[model samples]
Target chain A: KITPEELERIAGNFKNAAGEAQSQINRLEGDINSLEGQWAGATQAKFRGEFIQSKQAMQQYIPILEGISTDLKRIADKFR
Target chain B: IKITPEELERIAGNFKNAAGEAQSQINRLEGDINSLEGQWAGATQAKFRGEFIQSKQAMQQYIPILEGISTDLKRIADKFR
Candidate 1:
């Protein structure tokens, strides 16, 4: 059997992890968008394509994380 | 050239840093999921495990993308300069 305090801590970890990962994505997205302006030529064109691809991949994680963390918080509350 | 070699190297540094930072977060996430596994069970935990697998795989996709961007930038810089 797990204690309520411990459950909360575990839930907190999920919450923190989601936020941290989102922070990385947010910063990365901003930087990529801004820096693309500085680029030109074929390589820039390729970077632009890859830029879209990378964003698409990175965007997929946050929803799952938010959902998991929310559920974990609910679980923690129930155990308390 | 529209973009300078030095600029490319600078951008590569940022990409490398981004990948490294992401890896750190992924490491933390792995631990968090492991802890969840220990306490949770049944259908809900099953859902987490499945969702986590999807999320982790997607989150991990950025590291390689960033790394590739960094490497390509450096390679171009090396050739042009």
Candidate 2:
């Protein structure tokens, strides 16, 4: 089989995101990482309000990053 | 439910400020996308670029989709199939 979980996550965020989509997965991953950093500050601020709430809030942004990663793998797996 | 004016004010202010910041970023993004469209329109591969440009225009529609997904998250329990 394949890394289904990762594949699903990537697809969720990055199904069709950049130039050279096939080769651009890596770039998308990089972009996702950068976006996460942007989100991280907002996230840490959310959590700073309270530790437990902060950790809980992370799922929203984390899935966006992981979704893109999962999606890219799915594309490669699907037909390529 | 028991709450104080100070707590309510802080919560309201935080979300309000966050919303304002998000709005500003969205506006800046629109500007950036417009500039990219300009460059895309002028390239030698104008027809091909036109296709991509149109597609990118379509992609802007995802804002509502993204908003819906994010909005759903704030309300739901985390579960997977």
Candidate 3:
């Protein structure tokens, strides 16, 4: 069995880690969108290609990070 | 703060679920991106000149870091199971 204190500590750690990951993701999205806007203004082949690739990559990861955020919150609630 | 084996097992289940979803998304996104790359160049991609290359490169720099974090999280989740 895991003690409540141990559980709480783990919960805190997960929460913080998950929160940080989500924050990074949000910033990344913002940067992608800004670049997309620039692409719209003036497209470069390499830039467009990389942007498309990166955007798709980010789309893939956002939900997973969100899932972590949600699940960590649920687990932390259990301890509280 | 006390949890039984059952609770740990449940937590592990959640971790696995999250990891699976993350992997699936990664796979799906890769598929789509691959298709887009195939269609690139010529009339299909003439709009991209030279001005936006820097912004695109910036995006390139940012993408792997996100992948690293997701992979990191996935590894951590694997440990829970």
lDDT of each: 0.45, 0.34, 0.41
Question: What TM-score does candidate 1 reach?
Answer: 0.37
Residue lDDT tens for model 2, A1-80: 21223223332332232212222222222332343445534544432323233233333434443443343233223221
Question: By the lDDT metric, which is better: model 1 or model 2?
Answer: 1
Task: Tell me the tens digit of each residue's lDDT in model 3 across B1-81.
Answer: 332323333443444345444434333333333343555556534432221232233223434544576565444333323
TM-score of each: 0.37, 0.30, 0.39
**What's model 2's lDDT at A69?**
34
Question: Which parts of model 1 have CA positions greater than 4 angstroms off?
Answer: A39-43, A69-80, B1-81
lDDT of 2 at A72: 29
Position B20, candidate 1: lDDT: 46
Every candidate's DockQ is 0.06, 0.03, 0.02
lDDT of 1: 0.45
| Native contact fraction per model | 0.00, 0.00, 0.01
- DockQ ranking of the models: 1, 2, 3
Candidate 3 residue B67 C-alpha distance from true site, Å: 9.4
Best by DockQ: 1
